[PDB]
Symmetry: D2
Subunit: 331 residues, 4 copies
């Protein structure tokens, strides 16, 4: 005889179970951007957030929940314990250790590895069938780490790899050609960051190859210096971090885009990081970005792009470096 | 023989005026939430951002540009100079000091009134015809301030006001009833702050008045203590602030909602702050929230909510404090 | 080797379980408006169509497919055999005779019950767990029929019922008020047809009772003749049929609206056809519209609207008319 | 006191300038498919419809209006009088005779020109600065006709052209490769009809040339027979017309795609009919489809595709046919 029972006659028993649920692990700037991007595209019927910093955590969930009136994601949960994560179709990992001067390289990744040693088994425990999307840097190596710890088949472990990189290149291409980024095509492949590969030959508007029309494209001997676009892609992140302290909006939109293909089983093609041992002369267990078909089973297929022998070596080189790092890691 | 000329044949050297342009002033946590919300709802063809911190400004502009590939707003610009703002349909003011843990919105007034005296005249010079949407706290007073300085008729100066408070209210109502906030209706009017008014008589689902079903609603002796919903609404800012340091996502979605009504001339009804002199008897030029019809000319109409004498006494009470602050003000 | 195989390396194979499949039975004018609306709101990952007219079926199927580039529904299938229907979460029934000019929906009952004998058993055989969304007229009776035939628990058999009449009501109220229909609240309940009942007491804007403000709302003496608004809702279908031969856009949009709450587990409240025995003096298995919570398990709850003795009498009358037809039925 | 006066306190009158108005001329199958797809993408703040058949026109308008609750387009009007179309940003012409089974679109010319002789002056009179989007067939000749009669600069006279043919092409391409159409690139250029030209050289996935992998692509030689994909494109309209009698959904989606780029000033690239005298060796005022940047001013730029030797001759032949027809046109 409460107000609720006087107002509502109940008919049904107890069968909840979110059908289309996503978890984001890490509520730093990247994680919440992914979160907001996912809420505003209606990708999920349940959103769960996890982090080890409890005050931050809860505060972010509340803020988001207070905007429910303007969303169509009817349940938003969070917490330090991975039970809130239960039965997620997709889990996005952004958590990472904060970097720091006064230490070199293996230190950084090993530290993140120590964190994934606790995060990963927790996620698989609660969502043994989910697809994993890794965003934490260095991304290609952490995707391998997530892949090894989890035990998942390679199709279900995906690193954001060069996805944003390629988005950046398309913005810059579009800005020069006075064309919208959707209509400028170009792929940034390989290792996310400094050693990424701009595949000039695939660069085009409307099917029209820019290399075929402008042979100097991507070389050092070109009056337009297109090579600069790619050097801008590599340096844009540092630039943004220098300017604002971190990047968030763009990687969030970027990750929402992947989530959409997967949640909705689109089979769109996106540059993401995948386990390519057995391709391009690559002989070790390493993750690099190639064009992958993304749907309800994660990466079900990838595109074999034809690469120049120079592009092959760049890839190979990255592979040897990631493997060198990886074989020194403590799991 | 440039690549661009070889690739693209130009028809129109010409270039039009900005048509569906929004400017956000202040790119802090609220400003950027508003920006991203706006961009994900396709509300504008041009987004302009202004701040006094240059590097932060450039950083946020670039991060947003980097996700252009996934958006549908082809022009994103920024600058310290208000020329980048010209011909904006809507200008959103999110700049100024924010609350520390426990601090009253009312303790921000002198320093935000200063800031406004420098911002507004610059906004007006470049967009004499825009609607002004004020978010900065204390929002009801700053809406009065924007109004006096700009010289705009009252229909074009809107305070985000109680649109957030009512959304929080519906969120909690919905959590109690197990119904989506879109289907739970209820209004919080007055000051966006401690002295806001829950109009118990309008709370309902499917048109059935909860007050009528349960006459103790909103009363001390209400065994269900619905009063507490209002008090959690009142307290929501502090709780979230003390948890993550500020609020942003909700006000972001809230602000996008108002923008949507304005840009698309929807004529929907929202609780926002407006000049209510000549209502509820109320005598002075005070701005506070009451439901308003919102559209291409801003606030074209006010809804006359029926209030009990207690409610009206609270509203007027709020009107009294607020005018006392404005009247003493600096400009 | 095949072009496909030189371009694409396959990791998995052809998995094929759709997670959010919708079926539309009947590709007439209503079926196809429901389809395109659903397609444009991204409610499904697979859409399947069926009809007995095979050439028409294929054409519609193909015309939607040719628009895939512009959609986010990656599989569209059709067939006269219900196997194309397998594993649907939501099956929408729009097949059957429709009203000629001036014709009562009730006059359609025997023809439509005759095709339901076949359609319902076939749909349940391939989607035993689906929710059933009935649209064919007379919609309340056919919801009862589908319920009796299928054996489904009543939470999973839903009539589109008065979502459309309420929407038309709010359109007309908004027109009189200069307010977007979204901010007008008004419920049309009971038979989707001539015996419908407008609930005067729940009509409001911003939570303010129009009836309390204007105590003659809904009455014969009312100078404003608001009762004319409901007459218009009652006549609306007839006027549209007389003008264009049938109706389709509004229903397509109403059905997509119900589908959305169901597929995204929103728990929004709509006026839909459901079993009302036990309420308002009704002692038989009558199906008509009452406000219900719609979510992933169909109707989970009913809002118990409070009615004036006049309002209730009218509703009980609508229930008698309906029962009077149901009882004679033989299927 | 009337309800409205009692409820709402008015601030001002004014009201006028529609901000983003679109008009559809012709409410047949095609026009309403355009109307609905535009309504569901929130591209306009006002939509006007016209037709010569008065009852049908009013009926469709009412049907759309009855769906207002589910839309964000606050005003829909219609009339046989073109004053209802005043100040449209975009006017879409779908009126006219359509193909019977097996009929060439070129056979409709004399019938549709006579219609355009009355229509174009009426549209331009009320909306002198609108962009005109032509859909009636034969769409390339009628775009030329609209251009001659209206006196508009060529940027503002656009034929929906091959946007649809290319969408068909990418749909079939994607079916063959197991990849979403969004991710399959390929262009169909020239006449929207039997003489269209598939540009094999620009066909690709992730920038990887299908023609380079598979040199016999598109010729009579290839065991894969890719040419049949283009034949299905040319034939698609007839097959569908035979099945269902006309086509409607894909064109409506195609047109809504174009409208989006025009209304939101996206500068995306589409194959649409435009004036190409001066290109590929063509010397008369022929309009046909090439990739064009579309934005707030219509077509601002064309993309110069590199066409193989065989492709240039086809286009020419295509231009010759059309011109031959044109030369004989009287107006
Ligand atoms: N792949 C790409 O293109 C991009 C990758 N990133 C990477 O994304 C990651 C996130 O960056 P930000 O959000 O700015 O960093 P952040 O430091 O603000 O976020 C990390 C969050 O994860 C939490 N965390 C740490 N260990 C955890 C664990 N044991 N379990 C759960 N939560 C844990 C932290 O408390 C923190 O809230 C960084 O590694 C960054 O390098 C950032 C931008 C782009
Ligand atoms: N109305 C409402 O419901 C709510 C209001 N707020 C208010 O929003 C305001 C900002 O909040 P946050 O964004 O978190 O603060 P913030 O510190 O993150 O950002 C404020 C921004 O304003 C900028 N700014 C200061 N003076 C300026 C001027 N002269 N011209 C241009 N930009 C200037 C600052 O540089 C800063 O980037 C505060 O007043 C806060 O109280 C916050 C939440 C809700
Ligand atoms: N509930 C509501 O608010 C509304 C309901 N309707 C009702 O929807 C129904 C359909 O209307 P329209 O689409 O305009 O009719 P329509 O005449 O345009 O199409 C009816 C379709 O049903 C198919 N059909 C007939 N028997 C079938 C069976 N055995 N199995 C599969 N398909 C079969 C026909 O082949 C045809 O394609 C009518 O009953 C009409 O009264 C119409 C508007 C609103
Ligand atoms: N370009 C493309 O990809 C496509 C073009 N079409 C063309 O679209 C056109 C429309 O076809 P439907 O909509 O299926 O035909 P429809 O027969 O369904 O409707 C044609 C409408 O135009 C109206 N109309 C006729 N004469 C008129 C005049 N003098 N002034 C104003 N309105 C007039 C009619 O009353 C009728 O309502 C046809 O020319 C068709 O070939 C159709 C599909 C695709």
């Amino acid at each position: 005889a409460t107000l609720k029972d006087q107002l509502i006659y109940n008919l049904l028993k107890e069968e909840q179970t979110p059908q289309n649920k996503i978890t984001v692990v890490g509520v730093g700037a990247v994680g919440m951007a992914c979160a907001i991007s996912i809420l505003m595209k209606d990708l999920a019927d349940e959103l769960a957030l996890v982090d080890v910093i409890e005050d931050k955590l809860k505060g972010e969930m509340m803020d988001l929940q207070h905007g429910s009136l303007f969303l169509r994601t009817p349940k938003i949960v969070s917490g330090k314990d991975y039970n809130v994560t239960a039965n997620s179709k997709l889990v996005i990992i952004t958590a990472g250790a904060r970097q720091q001067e006064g230490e070199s390289r293996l230190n950084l990744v090993q530290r993140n590895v120590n964190i994934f040693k606790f995060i990963i088994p927790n996620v698989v425990k609660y969502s043994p069938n989910c697809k994993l999307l890794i965003v934490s840097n260095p991304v290609d190596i952490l995707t391998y780490v997530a892949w090894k710890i989890s035990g998942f088949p390679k199709n279900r472990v995906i690193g954001s790899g060069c996805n944003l990189d390629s988005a950046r290149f398309r913005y810059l291409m579009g800005e020069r050609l006075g064309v919208h980024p959707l209509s400028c095509h170009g792929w940034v492949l390989g290792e996310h960051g400094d050693s990424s590969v701009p595949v000039w030959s695939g660069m085009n508007v409307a099917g029209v190859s820019l290399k075929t029309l402008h042979p100097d494209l991507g070389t050092d001997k070109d009056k337009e210096q297109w090579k600069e676009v790619h050097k801008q892609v590599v340096e844009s992140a540092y630039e943004v971090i220098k300017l604002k302290g971190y990047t968030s909006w763009a990687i969030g939109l970027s990750v929402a885009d992947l989530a959409e293909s997967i949640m909705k089983n689109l089979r769109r093609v996106h540059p993401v990081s995948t386990m390519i041992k057995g391709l391009y002369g690559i002989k070790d267990d390493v993750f690099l970005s190639v064009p992958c078909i993304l749907g309800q089973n994660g990466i079900s297929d990838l595109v074999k792009v034809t690469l120049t022998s120079e592009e092959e070596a760049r890839l190979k080189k990255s592979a040897d470096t990631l493997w060198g790092i990886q074989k020194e890691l403590q799991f």
